Design a protein around this nucleic acid. Structure first.
Length: 97
RNA sequence: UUGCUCAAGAGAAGUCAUUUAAUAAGGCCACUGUUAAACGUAGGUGAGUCGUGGCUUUAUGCC
């Protein structure tokens, strides 16, 4: 909280910490063409909150990351991050569909 | 250390249930492959099984 109401980085315990890891956003390798999916839910009772449309994209995603390994408080923490980068569980999205 | 430092639009959802492209139709009616002749005379070959049996003089040939 104090990091936003002061100019320096200390206020003494540190006020903030720039993350040693920074990753750019992932972009699709292929230009997006308008593709949607129908979503009508089962049942004869056709009220609202049914017949929805979901946009999807059938391409590959690429992203760029960079870490200052020296900036890490514990130098050994870079290895678990690499393991996570290769074994990335799921990037937030409609994993159900 | 950058109007910065931190920052998931996220969790869930069947486009479903039903429908014969069906009923009818001749590619049909006509056509001669007609008419005539001297063979004068000189062109060749690719493929197994093994020790007496009925006649006949061993003979040597027949089945």
């Amino acid at each position: 909280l104090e990091s936003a109401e002061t100019e320096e980085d200390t206020s003494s315990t540190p006020n903030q910490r720039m993350g040693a890891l920074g990753m750019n956003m992932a972009v699709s390798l292929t230009p997006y063409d308008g593709a949607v999916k129908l979503g009508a839910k089962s049942g004869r009772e056709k009220d609202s909150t049914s017949l929805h449309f979901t946009e999807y994209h059938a391409t590959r995603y690429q992203y760029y990351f960079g870490i200052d390994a020296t900036h890490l408080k514990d130098f050994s923490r870079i290895l678990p991050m690499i393991d996570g980068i290769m074994n990335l569980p799921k990037v937030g999205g409609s994993s159900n569909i």
